[PDB]
DNA sequence: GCTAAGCGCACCTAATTTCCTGACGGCAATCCT
RNA sequence: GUGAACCGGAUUGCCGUCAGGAAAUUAGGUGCGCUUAGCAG
């Protein structure tokens, strides 16, 4: 069973991710330049929004000596814990390790502290580095990491440290065709001068764009990477259906403060997954009557429609839920009266997720 | 034009991956022209146009653009001849045309004796049997046929 | 008899198939740089699906050390020019440290086409290997055709969530296998008053007109979305807006 | 806690952002064009204006070695002033250095005293100064807008080292865009010779770039971030929103208004206090459409209510009420007649509004905050 | 149930080329020795 | 069924977070749509 979530979301001149040049990141979709959102970006922002602050237990780190060394108030073992990851199999203050939080502040406190051997110790912390994977955001991001064989003492073995992934994110396209645009920009100097310049004078890219956004939650791999918990992996499909429709990347939003917030979720259960991104193959061209958002709408429910008189099995009917705040923009607005249960309300909406998953109520988490 | 094929095999066990790279050729078409006794040609012709194996072009993942019995069997003496009668069909108005024209034919033993020059290349791709795995060699010879100096 | 299946599926930007670099696979036509998913990649992708787990199993299907496996299938040729792209990605520390980014700063490689796949499967020596079992080569034949309509190559698919189904599938039953790949020796340019899937469709179907000018196929569109010619004339045998529908035709057009 | 401030005003025909080649700012929200007004321009009238003169003392300046010789008096030392800073990681160019240095206007007297001594060698006097000016944070412009400092590496001391020189922004400021189709005017302007002589002709013909449009501006201020920026001082923290949001109200940017006097005052004002930013910029997706039975502020209003209603309705239904104030001169502009419940209060003033806003956040008379004053 | 014609002007003069920022992080594979 | 039959480059990743094109301008000068008529035995 996975959980579908595509999100019609228009935004606010911004420039929410950018390359090295700085120009907001571009792709091409049926032939015509669209504005993407790398899905990298969306990931992080629910990793880090404050609807994740109860379900981020792992941690993506390098310097992961400091992180031990700083659970501790007086006890100052920092070389000894350099060195123990050095002889694990990093090299520099090394690779980037995905794993928890407080499992490696414990661990790495009651076996790296101890006066005792070296080489055993270094594999009882790669014993716990491997084990470390009660985190929903490791089950939600997945992981892997294989050490230099090279660096690597013989004495040190690794169990399996693959993590498969239970979320598929899709980069952001525009349903329309991408308008960069060039904002051009002075630093004013205070002290007044005899020439009366700017400081500095550069050029900022922005674009502003109408994003499709696709997500995919394998619910049975989310229960399998956090094992019989099945109470948190419903905690964490509902925190991250919270956190990808109310938070938006963390771009140059001090300047573009585009924090709009999607006009249409729509969440599908099925067995298979399918990306709706060929509904905007033609770019949408925005005419006098409707608005962009109103014709995205629309082209993406003419694409639903042709899908489920398309590819349909009738053994496994797909139900899906569509939200929209307070019922604005529907979905067959014309003629496709097929959606019943329309909501208008996104707590509405997490809980008929949860109820249609199982058993699940958004207080029921409040019990550990 | 270079594919890198990877190959998991079989997957006690062991992460083992063969390694292999493919050399293709794109945007290539060729004409294979065969001489023989006239029944055995039509009855090759007849086959084809009745193929009952999936046919393909060297390797199962080639399939043929273009139908194999698109020019029909015909009697002309020379391959020469065969080769310059057929008109060179052009994909649009103004497009470069190949002013040179590889070309392979075999080579003709005539009478008894008379053996290939040290200039002759040399083909293995005559196969008889695959234990051991033998091509006898075969000897290539190269021609030119150039279009707009036997024709007005 | 033989039978054809032609597809014409666009792409999410992802990236699907890989070579040693990182690059998507690419390959060159009609004097234009294209696209490419491999042979090889489909056909994984078409095993180790879960739609057909829930003779001897495993064997008539893919042969295993003869065999002479009847299925083959031709590598996805862009309709289009390939655009590969730049990924610039950074990994964050997401702690407070003396400096700033810690990832690979790596450049990951994508490309979104238009491809043209081709499947050819012979009905004979699929029953050849079956025992006779027609019954039985007729249901695995609709298996591999909902599986190769449903499934895409697991690339990665992670970051780039391409999903998407193709647009139209045409089912022919010509005597000799031939292969559409050069309806697009043309690229397909996009104008202002059509759209890429349509304008291949549209390329697919001009080049199905012609040369037949100057036997019978089964066209398939979800919802008849993309119509291969709007005519009455003898064009297409059937036009088939339900998948299942169109394998059922299949079925019993072959038994 | 978040202070979210929306506002609806529209402007007379004017140019008060303009590129290199002198059009008015434009922008591609919802596939039609808009009329732009950049977040920086907003943010230096707000900095640059006489409600937020007290709360001064962050300067951006490139001349650091003319305010350390003018602190310092007539005591010379420009020069060895300016190899100081050389050595501690802004090369100058000509007499100024290369790049801008944001720092608080009252630690320029100790810069000037560290220069000033001869026991101090120089090496020891970069690394003063470069304690001293990355220390510089106090400044509440500073606070709000934040700073990055990045030293030449390689033109730098080898024993300097550096400490943190990044402030968080406690202020978001989006750019400022039409609700409607905007459409630029061109003027053609001609300058006259006062003196006859016999051409009879004109001193320069040239081309003029104007548009007026009614805008939405969204301002976003964190309360914990200003209050931590400014190291616990709640006091400063409710003065400098008090009067960002009087400022905010009441000025204008300053570009091109001799020959356009676009002054006009925001003709509605919603201030929403929330834990997650919002903005409704979506609301004017549909470009505003001017009908004769209506106005085009209204208009702009009545779109506005009806977004911020549907969010409400669909977003913000939980345990904990979004509690917003709605600000219109007099009650001009109400909100949607269909709802008349979307704002907590109607206030009909700036001031009172101003004090209702600082009673919510955590108590505070604008009297006692405007009271901290040095003289 | 349906009246037409003649006539429509020239342009001198079009401003100011280095005011432009720095830094940190960039495999892990060695797929019959 | 001929360098061909068995054949995935598989996974982890926000650039993030500095910024007023501003101080200059009268399109100023010229002019008749104008000659014809019963909605009535």
New binding site residues.
């Given amino acids: 069973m996975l959980i579908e979530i595509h999100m019609i979301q228009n935004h606010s001149p911004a420039?929410?991710?950018?390359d090295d040049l700085?120009a907001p990141?571009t792709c091409y979709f049926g032939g015509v330049l669209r504005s993407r959102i790398?899905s990298?970006?969306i990931?992080?922002?629910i990793?880090?929004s404050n609807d994740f602050k109860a379900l981020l237990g792992g941690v993506?780190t390098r310097r992961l000596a400091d992180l031990i060394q700083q659970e501790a108030g007086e006890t100052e073992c920092w070389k000894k814990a350099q060195e123990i990851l050095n002889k694990c199999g990093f090299?520099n203050t090394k690779?980037?390790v995905?794993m928890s939080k407080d499992k490696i502040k414990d661990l790495a406190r009651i076996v790296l502290d101890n006066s005792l051997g070296l080489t055993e110790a270094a594999q009882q912390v790669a014993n716990v580095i491997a084990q470390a994977t009660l985190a929903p955001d490791i089950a939600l991001?997945?992981?892997?990491?294989?050490?230099?064989?090279?660096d690597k003492d013989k004495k040190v073995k690794w169990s399996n440290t693959?993590?498969?992934?239970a979320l598929q994110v899709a980069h952001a396209i525009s349903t329309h065709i991408a308008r960069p645009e060039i904002?051009?920009?002075?630093?004013?100097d205070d002290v007044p001068g005899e020439?009366?310049?700017?400081?500095?004078?550069?050029e900022?890219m922005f674009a502003s764009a109408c994003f499709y956004k696709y997500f995919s939650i394998d619910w049975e791999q989310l229960v399998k990477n956090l094992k019989g918990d099945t109470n948190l992996a419903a905690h964490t499909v509902g925190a991250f259906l919270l956190a990808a429709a109310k938070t938006n990347?963390?771009?140059?939003?001090?300047?573009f403060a585009a924090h709009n917030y999607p006009d249409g979720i729509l969440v599908e259960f099925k067995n298979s997954p399918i990306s709706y991104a060929n509904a905007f193959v033609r770019p949408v061209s925005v005419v006098k009557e409707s608005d962009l958002v109103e014709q995205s709408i629309g082209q993406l429910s003419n694409y639903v429609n042709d899908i489920r008189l398309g590819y349909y099995d009738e053994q496994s009917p797909v139900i899906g839920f569509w939200f929209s705040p307070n019922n604005r923009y529907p979905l067959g607005y014309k003629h496709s009266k097929l959606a019943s249960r329309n909501i208008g309300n996104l707590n509405e909406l997490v809980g008929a997720v949860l109820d249609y998953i199982g058993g699940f109520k958004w207080e029921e988490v409040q019990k550990s | 034009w270079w594919d890198?094929?990877?190959?998991?095999?079989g997957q006690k066990t062991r992460?083992?991956?063969?390694?292999?790279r493919?050399e293709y050729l794109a945007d290539a078409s060729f004409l294979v022209a065969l001489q023989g006794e006239p029944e055995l040609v039509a009855k090759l012709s007849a086959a084809l146009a009745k193929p009952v194996?999936?046919?393909?072009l060297?390797?199962?993942?080639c399939p043929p653009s273009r139908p194999v019995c698109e020019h029909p069997p015909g009697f002309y003496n020379t391959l020469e001849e065969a080769l310059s009668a057929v008109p060179l069909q052009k994909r649009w108005h103004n497009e470069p045309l190949p002013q040179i024209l590889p070309c392979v034919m075999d080579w003709i033993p005539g009478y008894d004796g008379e053996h290939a020059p040290d200039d002759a290349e040399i083909h293995?791709?005559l196969?008889v049997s695959?234990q051991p795995?033998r091509?006898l060699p075969r000897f290539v010879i190269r021609r030119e046929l150039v279009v707009g100096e036997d024709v007005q």
């Fill in positions: 420039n929410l991710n950018r700085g990141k790398s990298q970006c990931k992080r922002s990793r880090t993506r090299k690779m980037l995905f991001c997945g992981r892997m990491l294989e050490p230099n064989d090279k693959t993590v498969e992934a904002d051009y920009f002075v630093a004013a020439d009366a310049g700017a400081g500095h004078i550069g900022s990347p963390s771009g140059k939003q001090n300047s | 890198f094929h990877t190959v998991g095999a992460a083992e991956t063969l390694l292999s493919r194996w999936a046919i393909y060297g390797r199962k993942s293995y791709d196969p695959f795995p091509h």
